[PDB]
Amino acid sequence: TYKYVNLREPSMDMKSVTDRAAQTLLWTELIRGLGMTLSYLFREPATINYPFEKGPLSPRFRGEHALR
Amino acid sequence: VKQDMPPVGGYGPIDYKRNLPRRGLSGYSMFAVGIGALLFGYWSMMRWNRERRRLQIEDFEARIALMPLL
DSSP states (O other): OOOTTTTTOOOOOOHHHHHHHHHHTTTTTHHHHHHHHHHTTSOOOOOTTTSSSSSOTTOOOOSOOEEE | OOOOOEEEEEEEOOOOOOOOOOOOOHHHHHHHHHHHHHHHHHHHHHHHHHHHHHHHHHHHHHHHHHHHOO
């Protein structure tokens, strides 16, 4: 009913240590973040063109008061 | 009656786990690529610098030939 978040122990072998040193000296995860921003550059933006393009609403919407 | 209910078979799967695909090469590959790039640059620089030294020597001996009239 619970999980140990952030308790994983890093490895020690020469290949994994060389991989970590290469990531340190060459900045791999910074390139990953750059790639994620570059992916978000090529998507369709979710911006509507107000006032020609109103946002969606519901029939239950509460706004100005009126007398019937 | 009519209400908001799930269907008989339920809905589809919904993910809740961290997904990091671990894309990339090993450290040996990138280090070897960097070393090869360094060696190629060093070789090209050695060739162009030797040629530039020869050109500079030629220009200097041209000035040596032109010196006494000046």
